[PDB]
Symmetry: C3
Subunit: 243 residues, 3 copies
Amino acid sequence: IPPIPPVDFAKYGEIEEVPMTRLMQIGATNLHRSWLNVPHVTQFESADITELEAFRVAQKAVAKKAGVKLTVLPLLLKACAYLLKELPDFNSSLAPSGQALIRKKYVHIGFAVDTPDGLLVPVIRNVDQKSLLQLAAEAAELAEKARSKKLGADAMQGACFTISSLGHIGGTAFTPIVNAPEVAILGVSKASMQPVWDGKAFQPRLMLPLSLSYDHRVINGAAAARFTKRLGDLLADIRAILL
Amino acid sequence: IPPIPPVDFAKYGEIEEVPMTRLMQIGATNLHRSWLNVPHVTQFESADITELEAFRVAQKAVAKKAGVKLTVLPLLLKACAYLLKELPDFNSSLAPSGQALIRKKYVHIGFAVDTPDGLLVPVIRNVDQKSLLQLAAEAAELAEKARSKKLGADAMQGACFTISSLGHIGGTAFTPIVNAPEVAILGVSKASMQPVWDGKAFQPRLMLPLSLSYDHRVINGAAAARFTKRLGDLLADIRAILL
Amino acid sequence: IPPIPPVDFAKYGEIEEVPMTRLMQIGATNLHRSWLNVPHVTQFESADITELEAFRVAQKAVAKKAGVKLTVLPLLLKACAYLLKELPDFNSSLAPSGQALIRKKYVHIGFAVDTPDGLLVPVIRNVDQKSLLQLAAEAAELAEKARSKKLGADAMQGACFTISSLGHIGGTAFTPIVNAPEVAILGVSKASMQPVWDGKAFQPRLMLPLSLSYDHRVINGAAAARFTKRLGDLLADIRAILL
Ligand SMILES: CC(C)(COP(=O)(O)OP(=O)(O)OC[C@H]1O[C@@H](n2cnc3c(N)ncnc32)[C@H](O)[C@@H]1OP(=O)(O)O)[C@@H](O)C(=O)NCCC(=O)NCCSO
Ligand SMILES: CC(C)(COP(=O)(O)OP(=O)(O)OC[C@H]1O[C@@H](n2cnc3c(N)ncnc32)[C@H](O)[C@@H]1OP(=O)(O)O)[C@@H](O)C(=O)NCCC(=O)NCCSO
Ligand SMILES: CC(C)(COP(=O)(O)OP(=O)(O)OC[C@H]1O[C@@H](n2cnc3c(N)ncnc32)[C@H](O)[C@@H]1OP(=O)(O)O)[C@@H](O)C(=O)NCCC(=O)NCCSO
């Protein structure tokens, strides 16, 4: 690939060189490798989490008794685990021959944590088997280890899918980069109150923005529009996961 | 381009290898080729199809008498053909010297069909010369041949522009990949009722999400913001095509 | 990278070859170089410019007396200069060793101008030191020189960040390409009246669509969600820049 020509940046004013941490560098190399290997598409959707939110907030007592804080992330993790089992193509990777998919029968899910030194993506194993407060507690433990640089490589391996959550900061949508050899990544942005038409008038519903980026060699657009659609349905009524 | 390192995925759980159809593989190779050759931008827009819809639905009788089903796709196809003639840069391809555009004086348009074996994009020739019920009928014939694997290569060649429609499934917007050597692709997502300000109060209008991805070497951003804008205008009043 | 196979386009109809200007070609080569080097993410946001607009429109008299026309671009330029100093990572470039950032202590900002021959991006130097009517006047001078092909290379060098504005044409959002070796680019689309919930009811606020694309090797997603968030806040009350 052509390189970018070097520029004497100090011609224009005062410059200062600050160096990258090895995590940045590792991170930089991996994203570039994914960017060049994966033909990326992003499918955007909005889920009505009006009732999910009222549940989350009413279980605050139980959550405080268990020592966990229940945010939207354990709820996303449960729903995606369920879906990764209903739509296995999303749970798989392109074999190195380029002529097969390796379907994973397990569901481990990574989530992006933002630390001073760079990005880490700890993995929760067998997300499909834990409950909302287990996932709540583990998510929190892995994030504090990540931030403390006390997270060990054992816990950043073997993920099938990644959730990248910026809802705590802001934003309307974004287009995340697939962590190859995974095939998809859900980005989550900030929930807003919005008018949603009911057939007769607009009702304020609390809408969660979802951005699913995917590897188009493996996933075609209708399958991904279908994934986001089912996720939007599961989050509108999480009791459907009981069925 | 660096490859992605192989991972023993079976360390983490049970795996199963399922193979890709030759269509997937063909598809995979082509998208990767487009991804690396085309600097992609996506321009998003929403068109008010409140009146277009009421027309579509009122002509249901005529459509049933002709045996066709009239969806939004023949209407998109007519409007894009008209526009591909008003803005010829969108109707062209970058010559292999890299120093010229080959302007096509014809309008043939492909549309993405989703089949069990992978994606096919049949082509309707001379879209600019057929009527809404001709395009309606041909679209339907080509899609059933595509699904029946009875579509023959003659009909997947010489397209100038592609429409990729997921409105039947869901979604807010997405970023399609340009089918090189074409220069643009319109993605269409699901229409929603939305509040649109009239100067004094918000009115429910039925809004169609459009995502136009384009080859930025050939098309600059203002030309594409202008294409989506004119398309939004043509769909708001399709009688302007008579002018 | 594999090339795209040549197609005899004249099999399908009449073709015409028209050639690219040297600006297109230069432009084409640079975008391709950026596309392959930068792993791109776009973060979308909306800023409430209801009060900013009423200010802009009330200062029309002062502006007419100074000979300038004050649009939203000098206001974007001031706010981004302020922010490029609060968040210096956005004001920097990846050193050629790939292991350091070169932090620029200056703020010069480029803006995309659309001319018949192709795209030019003149640079305003030391944006952080000029006022709204200085930036208003210079922006206008550089754009008319650009359009007159009388802009000279001196003025297209040493930029730290680019603003690409299509608000004058239309569109909901788009994903611009980073001008390497810069690390981010703000795209601006058309402002719309929109319902924004106040805790009790929806209020029409005039919303500006922002699309920030960035070089993910250098900028991680939470930093960019934070940049767009602060910009949305500065534009909601530009007096915060006085603080
Ligand atoms: C650890 C975590 C992954 C997840 O955090 P979390 O458990 O959702 O929440 P948190 O950080 O504790 O913040 C929680 C508050 O914000 C709220 N919030 C979280 N998601 C929200 C959403 N999507 N919408 C609105 N509000 C949200 C929580 O519900 C919570 O409310 P209270 O303060 O009232 O309890 C996140 O802190 C993080 O670091 N994200 C970084 C992701 C990233 O950097 N991606 C970059 C790569 S881009 O390809
Ligand atoms: C054949 C077709 C292209 C087009 O189908 P179509 O003719 O528009 O409609 P359909 O499939 O018959 O479904 C029609 C129903 O959904 C509705 N629908 C279609 N577009 C709609 C839209 N954009 N918004 C809302 N509803 C829509 C129709 O109007 C119709 O309504 P009724 O059932 O009441 O008549 C589509 O079936 C298909 O396979 N699309 C796949 C595209 C794709 O996979 N892209 C992937 C690559 S991503 O880069
Ligand atoms: C010179 C300029 C950069 C900026 O123009 P400007 O100073 O904002 O405004 P303008 O062109 O004079 O048009 C101004 C009118 O549109 C309005 N307008 C500008 N931005 C607006 C916005 N974001 N929302 C709504 N309206 C807007 C102005 O406020 C102004 O209103 P009046 O006519 O009532 O005064 C632009 O003309 C241009 O050429 N943009 C091209 C960008 C581009 O091509 N990008 C492509 C690469 S894509 O990666």
